[PDB]
Amino acid sequence: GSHMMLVLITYDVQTSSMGGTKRLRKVAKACQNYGQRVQNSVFECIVDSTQLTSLKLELTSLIDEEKDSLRIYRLGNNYKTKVEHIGAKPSPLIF
Amino acid sequence: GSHMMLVLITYDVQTSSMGGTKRLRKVAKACQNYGQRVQNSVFECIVDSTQLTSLKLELTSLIDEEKDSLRIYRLGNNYKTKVEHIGAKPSPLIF
Structure with a gap:
């Protein structure tokens, strides 16, 4: 549809940390609703304007x-x- | 010029490791020849076709x-x- 858009989301997080690991999992889950996880912290989403917002x-x-x-x-x-x-x-x- | 192109490079590396740290430094140096480091491992380059290759x-x-x-x-x-x-x-x- 004419209303669709390709949106690339790049997330700079350090997952050596506990909090970064947690935040990445939550960001990935949110982006998965609208597309695909193509690298550990890069997401390809295809959305309309309302969904992007x-x-x-x-x-x-x-x-x-x-x-x-x-x-x-x-x-x-x-x-x-x-x-x-x-x-x-x-x-x-693991140690 | 008509021959120019916007190129986004996204590098998935774990820098908790020694080798990943080394590889990131080398990738960043290579990309800096053609653009800007906008996140730790995301680079915005503006290149012609020969430079991209x-x-x-x-x-x-x-x-x-x-x-x-x-x-x-x-x-x-x-x-x-x-x-x-x-x-x-x-x-x-640092420990």
Whole structure:
């Protein structure tokens, strides 16, 4: 539909930390409602304007703004793939 | 120029590790030749086709393909900003 948009969300979080691990799980769950997890902390979402706003509010509220950041890219409309994946696909604690 | 392209590079690396830290430093240095580091492991590059190929070869060779990945996005041409940054800006070992 003419109202749809490609949105790329890049989340800068350090998962060596407890809180970062928790926040990543919550951000991933929120983004999964609207798309796919293509790297550990990169999400490809396909949304209308209302969904983008709801998602963006949800994500803004989940992060630790002192420690983390999000970037939200609204890609120009695209109908043939313009992404290359190089390397591994994304996936208990142990001493 | 008509030959220019916006390219977003997203690098999935775990920097809790020694090798990941080393690889990130090398990837960042390579991408800095062509643009800006906007998150710890996200780079915005503005390149012609020859530069994109040279950069992409360099980056493919630097990563550990068992542990890491890159995604290379060729954004549609854009002349007014379509990115929102939310949260913190990117930046010795200690016990």
